[PDB]
Ligand binder design. Structure first.
Ligand SMILES: *[C@@H]1O[C@H](CO)[C@@H](O[C@@H]2O[C@H](CO)[C@@H](O)[C@H](O)[C@H]2NC(C)=O)[C@H](O)[C@H]1NC(C)=O
Ligand SMILES: *[C@@H]1O[C@H](CO)[C@@H](O[C@@H]2O[C@H](CO)[C@@H](O)[C@H](O)[C@H]2NC(C)=O)[C@H](O)[C@H]1NC(C)=O
Ligand SMILES: *[C@@H]1O[C@H](CO)[C@@H](O[C@@H]2O[C@H](CO)[C@@H](O)[C@H](O)[C@H]2NC(C)=O)[C@H](O)[C@H]1NC(C)=O
Ligand SMILES: *[C@@H]1O[C@H](CO)[C@@H](O[C@@H]2O[C@H](CO)[C@@H](O)[C@H](O)[C@H]2NC(C)=O)[C@H](O)[C@H]1NC(C)=O
Lengths: 195, 199
């Protein structure tokens, strides 16, 4: 019964770690430290070392990056996941209110889900549509290397994106989940022209 | 520099852990320990604890399981991956001979890739075919919650999977990459009849 973790305001707790999309905390109760990870940020506002805890965690679908090449081009932050311990000392954790045993590890993250970057946008070639079936789905335009941790945008059923004059250089990328599409370099003149 | 790792044979290498799909080892060149993770066990035969090393670690594409409900249905073994340490102290390891920074983390992994399954021509009614665009691809029929390790079959391009009596119970799932399919209960004797007399 991991109910100790969902009511952390009542008890003593330590924020053991804050990622981009979730938080690692342990609460102390009955003399028994209970370790936990959640997406909420709610009722942990009083915990030790909670100061930087954001108001809200994004809650878009994301998975860990497995190919190290891809970090630069696809990284969209960090998040905690339940791994298993190298020593046989696995201790029980609660992940988003699911009970398990394991060890917590932080891991750099790429966007996941099913999204549709529609390359043909004829009505205005600089207003592009994005459509996904998922309840919630996330996009982000990212030159490879830029720190864009909290710059992700969540769009639910469908969306439409107009590129800023800044982003139009050849090296930016429209990441929307498992999909990824290179943004072409618009000439110095033409860019000023359109606006 | 991975150069020190990839030359396992020479140095005092200590196998520090074996997983279903890769191995964690650290070697020793002139007083500095280099932790490493590798997707094949060439070399390392004399390494300190090579006793349990597969001859081949499978190279089928797998990613880590994030939604922990799936684990029961999708398990397909465990693989080392590289993570960033919770404490600020991340150290240098080489992961499949790429130098980078972090900490070694072990996770339970599901199959990933592209393969599709509905297949063939109303024939070999107990056989279906799996086709995949990628170079290598994995499949595995797993009753949810089975002990499967190095039970995963590497196939390229195409394969045809002829079910058995056991699989045809209403409980086994055909795991192939990103897909799963449920194998339903057949009338065993209808099958039994067919296998018996037909060509
Ligand atoms: C704070 O802790 C108590 C102690 O567990 C929780 O009481 C549980 O309430 C949940 C309902 O959400 C039930 O599943 C359990 O039957 C209760 N367990 C008990 C009484 O031991 C309480 O609910 C927690 N706070 C919140 C908001 O759920
Ligand atoms: C981790 O959680 C599991 C889940 O209960 C504990 O594993 C044992 O699981 C069996 C089967 O459900 C039970 O019969 C045992 O009573 C469980 N053991 C205990 C102590 O509850 C496991 O022990 C937990 N803790 C660890 C592994 O340190
Ligand atoms: C494996 O490690 C050893 C280090 O002890 C390397 O040994 C020497 O490398 C030099 C060139 O760097 C050669 O000229 C020698 O013939 C090697 N042997 C000895 C006994 O000194 C060896 O080259 C390494 N193998 C690699 C890097 O592939
Ligand atoms: C792994 O991280 C360490 C730091 O934890 C790196 O050491 C840094 O090296 C860069 C460039 O060589 C310097 O700018 C930093 O000042 C160093 N930091 C410290 C704390 O010494 C190390 O280079 C990293 N390893 C790799 C392979 O990138």
């Amino acid at each position: 019964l991991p109910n100790n973790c969902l009511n952390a305001s009542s008890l003593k707790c330590e924020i053991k770690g804050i990622s981009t999309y979730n938080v690692y905390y342990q609460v102390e109760n009955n003399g028994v430290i209970y370790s936990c990870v959640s997406d909420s940020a709610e009722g942990l506002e009083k915990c030790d070392n909670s100061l930087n805890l954001p108001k809200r965690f994004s809650k878009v679908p994301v998975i860990p990056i497995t190919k190290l090449d891809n970090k630069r081009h696809f990284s969209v932050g960090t998040k905690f996941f339940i791994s298993e311990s190298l020593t046989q000392d696995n201790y029980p954790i609660t992940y988003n209110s699911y009970p398990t045993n394991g060890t917590v590890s932080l891991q750099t993250v790429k966007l996941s889900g099913d999204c549709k970057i529609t390359k043909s946008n004829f009505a205005n070639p600089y207003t592009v549509s994005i459509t996904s079936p998922e309840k919630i789905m996330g996009y982000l335009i990212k030159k490879p290397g830029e720190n864009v941790e909290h710059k992700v945008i969540s769009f639910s059923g469908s969306a439409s994106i107009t590129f800023t004059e800044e982003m139009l250089d050849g090296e930016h990328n429209l990441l929307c989940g498992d999909k990824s599409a290179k943004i072409p370099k618009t000439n110095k003149r033409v860019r000023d022209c359109i606006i």
